[PDB]
Design a protein around this ligand. Structure first.
Ligand SMILES: *[C@@H]1O[C@H](CO)[C@@H](O[C@@H]2O[C@H](CO)[C@@H](O)[C@H](O)[C@H]2NC(C)=O)[C@H](O)[C@H]1NC(C)=O
Ligand SMILES: *[C@@H]1O[C@H](CO)[C@@H](O[C@@H]2O[C@H](CO)[C@@H](O)[C@H](O)[C@H]2NC(C)=O)[C@H](O)[C@H]1NC(C)=O
Ligand SMILES: *[C@@H]1O[C@H](CO)[C@@H](O[C@@H]2O[C@H](CO)[C@@H](O)[C@H](O)[C@H]2NC(C)=O)[C@H](O)[C@H]1NC(C)=O
Ligand SMILES: *[C@@H]1O[C@H](CO)[C@@H](O[C@@H]2O[C@H](CO)[C@@H](O)[C@H](O)[C@H]2NC(C)=O)[C@H](O)[C@H]1NC(C)=O
Ligand SMILES: *[C@@H]1O[C@H](CO)[C@@H](O[C@@H]2O[C@H](CO)[C@@H](O)[C@H](O)[C@H]2NC(C)=O)[C@H](O)[C@H]1NC(C)=O
Ligand SMILES: *[C@@H]1O[C@H](CO)[C@@H](O)[C@H](O)[C@H]1NC(C)=O
Ligand SMILES: *[C@@H]1O[C@H](CO)[C@@H](O)[C@H](O)[C@H]1NC(C)=O
Ligand SMILES: *[C@@H]1O[C@H](CO)[C@@H](O)[C@H](O)[C@H]1NC(C)=O
Ligand SMILES: *[C@@H]1O[C@H](CO)[C@@H](O)[C@H](O)[C@H]1NC(C)=O
Ligand SMILES: *[C@@H]1O[C@H](CO)[C@@H](O)[C@H](O)[C@H]1NC(C)=O
Ligand SMILES: *[C@@H]1O[C@H](CO)[C@@H](O)[C@H](O)[C@H]1NC(C)=O
Lengths: 117, 220, 147, 332
């Protein structure tokens, strides 16, 4: 059967911009034909691929995430896992906190849904 | 105060709630939308079918309509049961958090907020509950040199509570989660075994509070 | 695509994220037809217009194979008083290709032609000639009081 | 699943009749997309516990304990560890959905496609390595706040103090104690190399993901009462007025099959959500700290735990203290 697959639209809120990207899922996109990027989740058209890494904003798949950034456009990148940090381990060294901060965090949980008959 | 500005600034923080309520509407929406569906009959409105046709063919059409609308009801009620099960699980977890993080203190890490749990405050919300988890977080850390035990008079000393630390010249006993150096004293430590077995032991004096009183009385 | 997502969500305003839309599939470029390259026309003439036909107790059965049919020639003829195909549309026969064709030829009285439908019951349908319940094929009946 | 393609794809006279059933196809697609998003949510919740990726120091002076069997191996193209690699070999994955160009192909061709997980195995292994490094170099501190580095001996000392045994016992026997641990990890390596049933709870998941798909394809061969179970056959043989009668029966049958499949998927997704929440709780409490809950982090007095990844699953190595040789005494 002819090549087929789902198509997804990557977009920021229309209240911010009108530019969109198109992700043909599971398609080796040599068949689709400067912004063509062959992901591991198909092919992405309409976004610029950069080597810089950020936190994932818009999930694309297979380690690729999109974002809207400056000149403004949609950028696809390999999502950064977090800040790099090497712990200064040694067999006779210790760290002790000399100061503290009391932080409040909000945790929100649904308790019930609307009764219906 | 930072919460007050945060809830006044962002609207996505309450997503887990709206995702519930929206669905309660959305499923209802499609449960009405299926009425416009014909399901294969010549008309999707009941009064139309009734007016146009006589009993023997109106029965054939109304059976198809009834089957379609009954299948829609089956799908809707199964979706409702699954969502109700998820909500039951969420409500049981929330009740556990109310019973343990509010009416008491929890030793479970990260269960009542990211950090060392101090307390929590409950608040209501439309079809939901919001916990303000107040938690202690160590902030400014410093380096120190540590030994597992101190060899004073051929015997090993270990902390009753805390850690032996040194800034480079002197040794002290500090609690684990806050820096408060204190002189190595017999009250602060206990003795068990000699110094040959413990790996990395460091020589230092151990103060004995009875000795200066005894010496002062001797001078008396 | 953006207006198409506006259509999918039934909203003028669309939030940030991913949205699945109507899937893409590449359309066929053209059409290829393949049939066996036999050429001889099938002798339906002696099948359907015999001088004489067999009786129902010994209903005649002619095998049809290795020939090019043309059911449109029959279907356009008005001599067919009754013509009913129970497993295929009579018009579609030109576009369907068969492994074989059995022509079962016999003669009856006028009232027994309802008995020859598949799944029917009656003296003819019970004691001399019964079609299968899952019968596929066509039934042809025409008056011969002048022949 | 593409509802149109699955039911009777590549037919326009399909879409015309299928529109008569309303938004069932759209609802099914919405449910499947929700399940797909919930999978990513589960992975993010369980593994992305730390916002900082820690790395093990080049020096391995851990007081005699040997974590080489669970630390990452740079030789392998992936930073996957040794036991993690064993885990990846025990489970026989199917239809990973990495570029299709067989059962997997037969499932795919009918509109039943598999999206890839966002966090590929490499980032999962990196998360596991980060958590392991935090556990072995910072005690439980990194869970509560910043990374507070600490030598491993006094970390075990405070785990002993937590289990109600004085830390001195550790230091008078550390050479033996590590000798036990380095031995006990080895027993796992042989065990996972010997038995294949230990990972049943995982394969039972993956197998079902295939099996339901299998029967979801098998229903295509079903006729559901029509004269033929193939769409192109029906289309070729019959004209519109009777082809509609047959295609309505076929559509009803294939739509009911889709309803059953999507309900099964929703129930399995709910079970997986519960399992993933429990696993995230075990990651937050047994790894990033110490637990006073009996038997929650291993049979015995809990000392610590080490996380490891596995295909569509997580494996906790629970290290626990167990009293061994008892003696009688008289008490007042
Ligand atoms: C612990 O941190 C707090 C946080 O800043 C310190 O308090 C600040 O002290 C400075 C310098 O005098 C002031 O300018 C700020 O207004 C204080 N801020 C707050 C939030 O109180 C505190 O001094 C630190 N403790 C130690 C021992 O250094
Ligand atoms: C480590 O801490 C000790 C204790 O505070 C320091 O010793 C003190 O030094 C001061 C300043 O000269 C004196 O007034 C005290 O009498 C000392 N106290 C004790 C207990 O000895 C020591 O200088 C610190 N070392 C470093 C390198 O900072
Ligand atoms: C701690 O004190 C002990 C005892 O004073 C030291 O051990 C002595 O080391 C010397 C010099 O090599 C020897 O001559 C002795 O026989 C040792 N005596 C004992 C009792 O073992 C030890 O070296 C000191 N440790 C440190 C780090 O200064
Ligand atoms: C058998 O004889 C019939 C007589 O009805 C043939 O039908 C006629 O065909 C001629 C030319 O082929 C037409 O001019 C007539 O209009 C047809 N008759 C009618 C009433 O349609 C028929 O062709 C022969 N059948 C076969 C199978 O050869
Ligand atoms: C930690 O364990 C590893 C693996 O068991 C040890 O490395 C082995 O060392 C031996 C003896 O020289 C060799 O024969 C092997 O080829 C090594 N295997 C591997 C996988 O490297 C290592 O020595 C142990 N470290 C400690 C401190 O005990
Ligand atoms: C659209 O964006 C503007 C500027 O960022 C903001 O003020 C406004 O509230 C936004 N509207 C919606 C509906 O999000
Ligand atoms: C697509 O196929 C071509 C030809 O086989 C191959 O060179 C290329 O690597 C493929 N790309 C992907 C992303 O699979
Ligand atoms: C990323 O790095 C590769 C290899 O250095 C290079 O070929 C590519 O052009 C780079 N991409 C960008 C956007 O700089
Ligand atoms: C502790 O020492 C390490 C290594 O020298 C250093 O990177 C770190 O900044 C130090 N931390 C403090 C608080 O002095
Ligand atoms: C710590 O490491 C140093 C350097 O390898 C070594 O000389 C020292 O003996 C070690 N201390 C302990 C207690 O293992
Ligand atoms: C303790 O005493 C009981 C009863 O005499 C005996 O069965 C048991 O073996 C004893 N255990 C030890 C460790 O001596």
């Amino acid at each position: 059967p002819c090549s087929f697959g789902g198509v997804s639209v990557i977009t920021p809120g229309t209240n911010t911009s009108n530019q969109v990207a198109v992700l043909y899922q599971g398609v080796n996109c040599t068949e689709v034909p400067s912004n063509v990027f062959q992901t591991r989740a198909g092919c992405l058209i309409g976004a610029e691929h950069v080597n810089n890494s950020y936190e994932c904003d818009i999930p694309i798949g297979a380690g690729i995430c999109a974002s809207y950034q400056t000149s403004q456009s949609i950028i696809a990148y390999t999502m950064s896992l977090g800040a790099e940090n090497s712990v200064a381990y040694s067999n006779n060294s210790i760290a002790i906190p000399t100061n503290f901060t009391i932080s409040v965090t909000t945790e929100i949980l649904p308790v019930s849904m609307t009764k219906t008959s | 105060g930072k919460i007050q500005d945060s809830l006044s600034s962002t609207a996505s923080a309450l997503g887990k709630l709206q995702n519930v309520v929206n669905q309660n509407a959305q499923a209802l929406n499609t449960l009405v939308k299926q009425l416009s569906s014909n399901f294969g009959a010549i008309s999707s409105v009941l009064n139309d079918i009734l007016s146009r046709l006589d009993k023997v063919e109106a029965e054939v059409q109304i059976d198809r309509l009834i089957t379609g609308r009954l299948q829609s009801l089956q799908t809707y009620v199964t979706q409702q049961l699954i969502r109700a099960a998820e909500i039951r699980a969420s409500a049981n977890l929330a009740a556990t958090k109310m019973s343990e993080c509010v009416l008491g203190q929890s030793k479970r890490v990260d269960f009542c907020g990211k950090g060392y749990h101090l307390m929590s405050f409950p608040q209501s919300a439309p079809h939901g509950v919001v916990f303000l988890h107040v938690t202690y977080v160590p902030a400014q850390e410093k380096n120190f040199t540590t030994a597992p035990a101190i060899c004073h008079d051929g015997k090993a000393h270990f902390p009753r509570e805390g850690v032996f630390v040194s800034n480079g010249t002197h040794w002290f006993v500090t609690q684990r989660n806050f820096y408060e150096p204190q002189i190595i004293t017999t009250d602060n430590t206990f003795v068990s075994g000699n110094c040959d077995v413990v790996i990395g032991i460091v020589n230092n004096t151990v103060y004995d509070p009875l000795q200066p009183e005894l010496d002062s009385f001797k001078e008396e | 695509p953006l207006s198409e997502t506006k259509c999918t969500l039934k909203s003028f305003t669309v939030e940030k994220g991913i949205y699945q839309t109507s899937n893409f599939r590449v359309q066929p470029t053209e059409s290829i037809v393949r049939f066996p390259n036999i050429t001889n026309l099938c002798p339906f003439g002696e099948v359907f217009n015999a001088t004489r036909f067999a009786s129902v107790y010994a209903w005649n059965r002619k095998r049809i194979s290795n020939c090019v049919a043309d059911y449109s020639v029959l279907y356009n003829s008005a001599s067919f008083s009754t013509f009913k195909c129970y497993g295929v549309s009579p018009t579609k026969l030109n576009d369907l290709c068969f492994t074989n064709v059995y022509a079962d030829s016999f003669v009856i009285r006028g009232d027994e032609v309802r008995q020859i439908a598949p799944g029917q019951t009656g003296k003819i349908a019970d004691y001399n000639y019964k079609l299968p319940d899952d019968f596929t094929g066509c039934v042809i009946a025409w008056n011969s009081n002048n022949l | 699943v593409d509802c149109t393609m699955y039911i009777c794809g590549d037919s326009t006279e399909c879409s015309n009749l299928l529109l008569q059933y309303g938004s069932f196809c759209t609802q099914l697609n919405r449910a499947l997309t929700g399940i797909a998003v919930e999978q990513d949510k589960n992975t993010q919740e369980v593994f992305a516990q730390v916002k900082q990726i820690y790395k093990t120091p080049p020096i391995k002076d851990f007081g005699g304990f040997n974590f080489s069997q669970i630390l990452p191996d740079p030789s392998k193209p992936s930073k996957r560890s040794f036991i993690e690699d064993l885990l990846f070999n025990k489970v026989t994955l199917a239809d990973a959905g990495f570029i299709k160009q067989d059962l997997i192909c037969a499932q795919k061709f009918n509109g039943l496609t598999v999206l890839p997980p966002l966090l590929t195995d490499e980032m999962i292994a990196q998360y596991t390595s980060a958590l392991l490094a935090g556990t072995i170099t910072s005690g439980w501190t990194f869970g509560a706040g910043a990374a507070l580095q600490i030598p491993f001996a006094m970390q075990m000392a405070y785990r002993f103090n937590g289990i109600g045994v004085t830390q001195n016992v550790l230091y008078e026997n550390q050479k033996l104690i590590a000798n036990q641990f380095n031995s006990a990890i080895g027993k796992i390596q042989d065990s996972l190399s010997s038995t294949a049933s230990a990972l049943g709870k995982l394969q039972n998941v993956v197998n079902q993901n295939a099996q339901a798909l299998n029967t979801l394809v098998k229903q295509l061969s079903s006729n559901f009462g029509a004269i033929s179970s193939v769409l192109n056959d029906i289309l070729s043989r019959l004209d519109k007025v009777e082809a509609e009668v047959q295609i309505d029966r076929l559509i009803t049958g294939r739509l009911q099959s889709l309803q059953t499949y999507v309900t099964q998927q929703l129930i399995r997704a709910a079970e997986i959500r519960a399992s993933a929440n429990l696993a995230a709780t075990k990651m937050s409490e047994c790894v990033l700290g110490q637990s006073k809950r009996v038997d929650f982090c291993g049979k015995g007095y809990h000392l610590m735990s080490f996380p490891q990844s596995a295909p569509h699953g997580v494996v906790f190595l629970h290290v626990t203290y167990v009293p061994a040789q008892e003696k009688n005494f008289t008490t007042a």
